[PDB]
Design a protein around this nucleic acid. Structure first.
Ligand code: MG
Ligand code: MG
Ligand code: MG
Ligand code: MG
Ligand code: MG
Ligand code: MG
Ligand code: MG
Ligand code: MG
Ligand code: MG
Ligand code: MG
Ligand code: MG
Ligand code: MG
Ligand code: MG
Ligand code: MG
Ligand code: MG
Ligand code: MG
Ligand code: MG
Ligand code: MG
Ligand code: MG
Ligand code: MG
Ligand code: MG
Ligand code: MG
Ligand code: MG
Ligand code: MG
Ligand code: MG
Ligand code: MG
Ligand code: MG
Ligand code: MG
Ligand code: MG
Ligand code: MG
Ligand code: MG
Ligand code: MG
Ligand code: MG
Ligand code: MG
Ligand code: MG
Ligand code: MG
Ligand code: MG
Ligand code: MG
Ligand code: MG
Ligand code: MG
Ligand code: MG
Ligand code: MG
Ligand code: MG
Ligand code: MG
Ligand code: MG
Ligand code: MG
Ligand code: MG
Ligand code: MG
Ligand code: MG
Ligand code: MG
Ligand code: MG
Ligand code: MG
Ligand code: MG
Ligand code: MG
Ligand code: MG
Ligand code: MG
Ligand code: MG
Ligand code: MG
Ligand code: MG
Ligand code: MG
Ligand code: MG
Ligand code: MG
Ligand code: MG
Ligand code: MG
Ligand code: MG
Ligand code: MG
Ligand code: MG
Ligand code: MG
Ligand code: MG
Ligand code: MG
Ligand code: MG
Ligand code: MG
Ligand code: MG
Ligand code: MG
Ligand code: MG
Lengths: 64, 96, 76, 52
RNA sequence: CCAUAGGUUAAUGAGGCGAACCGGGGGAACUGAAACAUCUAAGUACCCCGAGGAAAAGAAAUCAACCGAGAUUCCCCCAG
RNA sequence: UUUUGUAUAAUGGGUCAGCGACUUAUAUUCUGUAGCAAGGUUAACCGAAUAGGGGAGCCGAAGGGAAACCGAGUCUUAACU
RNA sequence: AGGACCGAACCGACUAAUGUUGAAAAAUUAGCGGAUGACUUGUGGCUGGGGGUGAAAGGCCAAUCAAACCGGGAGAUAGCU
RNA sequence: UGUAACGGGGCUAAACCAUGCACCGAAGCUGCGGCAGCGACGCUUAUGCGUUGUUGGGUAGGGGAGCGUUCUGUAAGCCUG
RNA sequence: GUUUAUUAAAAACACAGCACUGUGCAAACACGAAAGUGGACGUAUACGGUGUGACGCCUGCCCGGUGCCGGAAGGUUAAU
RNA sequence: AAUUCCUUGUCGGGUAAGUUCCGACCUGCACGAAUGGCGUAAUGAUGGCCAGGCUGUCUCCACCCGAGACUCAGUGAAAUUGAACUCGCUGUGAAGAUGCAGUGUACCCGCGGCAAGACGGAAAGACCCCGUGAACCUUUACUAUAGCUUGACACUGAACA
RNA sequence: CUUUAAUGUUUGAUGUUCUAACGUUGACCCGUAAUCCGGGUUGCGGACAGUGUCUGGUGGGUAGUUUGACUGGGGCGGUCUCCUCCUAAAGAGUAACGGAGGAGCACGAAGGUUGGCUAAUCCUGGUCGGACAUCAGGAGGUUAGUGCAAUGGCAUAAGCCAGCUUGACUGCGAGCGUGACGGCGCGAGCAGGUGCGAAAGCAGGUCAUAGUGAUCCGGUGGUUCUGAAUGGAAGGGCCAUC
């Protein structure tokens, strides 16, 4: 049979041009009056998945 | 994705975005695909006959990728700025 | 008993030593107080972190009447 | 944790708001600060409203 | 009371068996979730009923998208 | 065999003969190899038929953005040194 | 008269010894309890598994019982050997 | 349990200290011969051949190269009363 | 008298008695999706459940908790 | 005390001597009145204690009668078993050695006996821990649920107040 | 509107009675050769009861399961995140059921800036006034201070007063620190707009290091980004936030 995509991981990652994955940062969903505005501003843009945990992402997303 | 009992990376991270249904019925066209049609006119129905965009597509842009040499009338499709300069330099006539 | 606690090691110290060429913005020393002090082309952070404001080699030196230790970036 | 948290609604008509805390026991009067409003790009007086 | 229930004949038919396939009436749990209750296993196993050489479905109160297609069933795609 | 470590007084086997354990299917990725090459390839099915037909599709030659949309750029932002 | 007494058949099983790959997957030998009663026995019947039945020991339900047996889900699962 | 606190015999040095020259002693090193790996370099490569250095204990594990077995093609061939 | 067939026969179970409580008969209760059946072809001197356990002398205080029974003015409260 | 931790409580009886027994005491760790209290004739293959009779129970065994064991003839198992050319000691060592070191002793092979060792045989320890194992069991654990119960609507109508 | 009646109908609530649904495990008749059943006559009951759907309570009667780890064995006890010091062997890091202490906040000024100021203690003198208030002199030199633990800082004070204020700004961020990662931290400069200062300048919270919680689901405001024929809308997205 076909491999099934981990459908939770398909809602968290998008493949970029050279094959890396972008994702939204954590810690920006709730409890926000105590966080500095400098801290939040560096959490709005999407970041790339680091090299260590990039192996687990590809296993969850076989169809890119 | 099992990391031991640690909360895995695909669940530590938040969901984001949505899926656009309108994006599935759009397509992008090389300039090299403009010569592959016949008659020198480009419609939605001409490109589907040339097996370029596919049947369910309803919107298409022409992109500066590849190159065109023959004069080609583009009709009813969006064109980027670099593709507009490249089509009109080779003798084309972009219209609607 | 009563003595199980300790905190995480905050990894302070001197990150770039003397005669060591850095880029602007490079952290030189992390420290609690101003155990070191900021000299020429060196800024002092919010948590008393000493970073380089320009590019060049690190110079440790002792100046002033109180014999305090100043860190400066020589030009390069 | 007696220090409750509030929000400072812009008086420039925009719904923009800064969020902060106050001790409502010792400071019953409302907090009003003149803060920057990034939508109108001016410094406008903000007034305290309930965080709701 | 008529009547009806009931009774007695007569005629025709049914009954029972059989591997799978089919339609229907019922319908688990182990298991997976690294526990587990929603969920999964799965309308699966099993039980029951009925049928045929196949059954079932089937001739739009259907799709589509302002262009159109034109009953049902099956296969490859669409597409993990 | 298991172990930090076994002549171990730790496990297993009386012996012989025969059997006895990393497979299969489909997806996917990588490497090798071969065919073609900005293209490559067909699936059911037809076909008398391992041919030929069939290009429905799939992958690739463009990306960015949550998205509309823009496009060798794009997003962020009122605007980016 | 008697859930009376002593005591064989019959029913039971208190103690010891033997036996423990036995003669026997619970018996023999010497003693022992009840022995007209809530007794014992033949034949046939009925109660079915989360159920029976139990003068109640979680006892018994075909040498198996804190949920029988047989077949099926089934190659349950086993981070263990 | 039996000498049983030099391994024993035994030793008044065959003990200890100092100094010296010998010798023994390993699968270390050297000699001789053989195989292989990886690098150099050159060849005139048959895509590996001289020379040349150097390497060659090994579990888990990774990589490279093979042997043999049954079956199919080669094979109505070849071997075989 | 009974009991762990196959390591326990006992002080354990049972027992006559006693008490509490349920039950008016299509009884309570029990087995049954239900029909029914047992109780019982019985009828409160009867039947079920529970505790105690011949007989003799006796069985004291506590209703706050937990149950059960009775109450129905108020508060709260479901579908609708 | 079927209950008493301290405890072999103390006192009395019994005995030459009594942690048990019997009678008292009350200081009841932590009895107690139908999960009954205290008595109680009779009964018990019931528990503890004492006495008489009796005796191989014993001091301390002796002999005898039979059935085996032993020998011959016939038949003929079993558990176990890596391989054996299968000694003692002291030491060593996966830390308790027939097998290692040192040393001592020992001709080769049966048969009848004994059971100290072969960490002897039998049963993948039941104890203990572990497994995100199982099973039954309990309850004011969680979530359900049969059953019981409440009301609304339906089956379900007519009058009058 | 304040203050309440009339008339009629508008349906409930409780008596109040009836029979025709329904019940009858009353009698009698018939099917019948029958204590079942059904039919019939009749009596009693009667819209109650009883069943269906919905619903509240009750519910170990029954069922599915859960019931943590570390641990000089397990249980018992203690512990579990975060900060500070020691152990830590002069970079970083470094364990134990090792030795000692804290945190789960506070502050609209205790922030920003400009201006100014400098402690503890002791001595002597002085109304109440005393070991100790306040005042004046002197020694002393931070032995004080820091909203709170410890450590490192702190006189240019980061300590202490006053004036004006909101930079406790929004968008960004070269370059580094620190982690397996999620993440956390430091940051000159740039754009906008602002405060203080004459000005140079300083300000993206506080002397620094504790004062904390991922994702999902859901709420609120903002935003046409999306809107399943089309126009809306619902819902979703993005931004802020709970
Ligand atoms: Mg949000
Ligand atoms: Mg966890
Ligand atoms: Mg096509
Ligand atoms: Mg399940
Ligand atoms: Mg599971
Ligand atoms: Mg048909
Ligand atoms: Mg039409
Ligand atoms: Mg083994
Ligand atoms: Mg072991
Ligand atoms: Mg071991
Ligand atoms: Mg060894
Ligand atoms: Mg041995
Ligand atoms: Mg062994
Ligand atoms: Mg073992
Ligand atoms: Mg063995
Ligand atoms: Mg390939
Ligand atoms: Mg290729
Ligand atoms: Mg008798
Ligand atoms: Mg018996
Ligand atoms: Mg006998
Ligand atoms: Mg007798
Ligand atoms: Mg028991
Ligand atoms: Mg049995
Ligand atoms: Mg069963
Ligand atoms: Mg079971
Ligand atoms: Mg299964
Ligand atoms: Mg199995
Ligand atoms: Mg000796
Ligand atoms: Mg010498
Ligand atoms: Mg060598
Ligand atoms: Mg050689
Ligand atoms: Mg070697
Ligand atoms: Mg090797
Ligand atoms: Mg062959
Ligand atoms: Mg008796
Ligand atoms: Mg027995
Ligand atoms: Mg017995
Ligand atoms: Mg009855
Ligand atoms: Mg009793
Ligand atoms: Mg009483
Ligand atoms: Mg009460
Ligand atoms: Mg009361
Ligand atoms: Mg009540
Ligand atoms: Mg007691
Ligand atoms: Mg005692
Ligand atoms: Mg005596
Ligand atoms: Mg005495
Ligand atoms: Mg005695
Ligand atoms: Mg006494
Ligand atoms: Mg008692
Ligand atoms: Mg009582
Ligand atoms: Mg009693
Ligand atoms: Mg013989
Ligand atoms: Mg020998
Ligand atoms: Mg030894
Ligand atoms: Mg012998
Ligand atoms: Mg022996
Ligand atoms: Mg013997
Ligand atoms: Mg032994
Ligand atoms: Mg053994
Ligand atoms: Mg075991
Ligand atoms: Mg249960
Ligand atoms: Mg389960
Ligand atoms: Mg544990
Ligand atoms: Mg312990
Ligand atoms: Mg260090
Ligand atoms: Mg060091
Ligand atoms: Mg301060
Ligand atoms: Mg100042
Ligand atoms: Mg300040
Ligand atoms: Mg501070
Ligand atoms: Mg969740
Ligand atoms: Mg629409
Ligand atoms: Mg729109
Ligand atoms: Mg619509």
């Amino acid at each position: 049979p076909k491999i099934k995509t981990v459908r939770g991981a398909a809602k968290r990652f998008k493949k970029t041009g050279k094959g890396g994955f972008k994702h939204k940062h954590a810690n920006l969903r709730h409890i926000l009056t105590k966080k500095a505005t400098k801290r939040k501003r560096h959490l709005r843009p999407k970041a790339m998945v680091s090299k260590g945990d990039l192996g687990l992402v590809i296993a969850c997303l076989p169809y890119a | 994705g099992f990391e031991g009992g640690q909360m895995p990376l695909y669940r530590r991270l938040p969901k984001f975005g949505f899926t656009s249904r309108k994006a599935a019925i759009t397509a992008e066209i090389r300039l090299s695909d403009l010569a592959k049609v016949e008659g020198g006119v480009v419609d939605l129905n001409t490109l589907k006959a040339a097996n370029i965009i596919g049947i369910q597509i309803e919107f298409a842009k022409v992109i500066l990728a590849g190159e065109v040499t023959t004069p080609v009338t583009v009709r009813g499709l969006r064109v980027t700025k670099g593709a507009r300069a490249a089509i009109e330099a080779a003798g084309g006539k972009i219209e609607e | 008993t009563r003595n199980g606690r300790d905190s995480e090691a905050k990894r302070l110290g001197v990150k770039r030593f003397g005669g060591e060429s850095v880029l602007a913005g490079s952290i030189i020393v992390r420290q609690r107080g101003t155990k070191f002090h900021a000299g020429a082309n060196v800024g002092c952070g919010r948590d008393h972190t000493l970073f380089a404001k320009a590019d060049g080699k690190v110079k440790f030196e002792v100046k002033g009447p109180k014999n305090r230790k100043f860190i400066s970036i020589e030009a390069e | 944790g007696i220090r409750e948290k509030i929000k400072l609604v812009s008086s420039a008509g925009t719904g923009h708001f800064y969020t902060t805390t106050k001790n409502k026991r010792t400071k019953p009067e409302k907090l009003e600060l003149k803060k920057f409003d990034p939508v109108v790009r001016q410094h406008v007086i903000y007034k305290e409203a309930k965080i709701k």
